């Protein structure tokens, strides 16, 4: 009955017709299938997704950049990404991706200054969430410290 209806029109019962290119005008061999399909639009609109961040709002407990798009939040650089970036001999990018670009407070300010001043260089320091962990264990009866 589909073919009967196609014949009531005039199109080929095969349902495929010959097309041409628009850039060259030379026929496409192997007749192709054109028709009418009911297309939708799903509300994952790209402008709701696209999001970047230069420098924004840190937290107080641990001075890591906030998370999400509602806030001016950075990206989640999870475990697996550290494993993978560690499989390469990539030893400096992994450093700066968890001391300067995230948490070392003095370090990241000096980084901003040295970037404005045309000097791509970093002073690592020591993270902050680590010191949080220390004061949090040492708050139990566990004397945890560092040697020389």
């Amino acid at each position: 009955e589909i073919k009967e209806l196609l014949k009531l029109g005039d199109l080929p019962t095969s349902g495929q017709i010959r097309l041409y290119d628009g850039r060259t005008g030379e026929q496409f061999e192997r007749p192709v299938t054109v028709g009418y399909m009911y297309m939708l639009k799903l509300n994952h609109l790209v402008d709701d997704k696209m999001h970047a961040r230069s420098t924004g709002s840190y937290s107080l407990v641990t001075q890591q950049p906030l998370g999400g798009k509602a806030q001016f939040g950075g990206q989640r650089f999870g475990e697996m990404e550290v494993w993978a970036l560690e499989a390469y001999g990539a030893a400096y990018t992994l450093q700066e991706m968890l001391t300067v670009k995230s948490d070392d407070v003095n370090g990241r300010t000096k980084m901003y200054k040295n970037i404005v001043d045309g000097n791509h260089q970093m002073e690592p320091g020591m993270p902050e969430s680590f010191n949080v962990l220390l004061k949090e264990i040492r708050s139990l009866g566990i004397n945890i410290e560092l040697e020389d």
Partner: peptide, 19 residues
């Protein structure tokens, strides 16, 4: 805890996301 959430994998500046 601090370990699996803030010492290994932390969020980072200078980053973006798209389709």
């Amino acid at each position: 805890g601090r370990f699996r959430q803030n010492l290994l994998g932390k969020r980072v500046d200078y980053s973006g996301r798209s389709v």
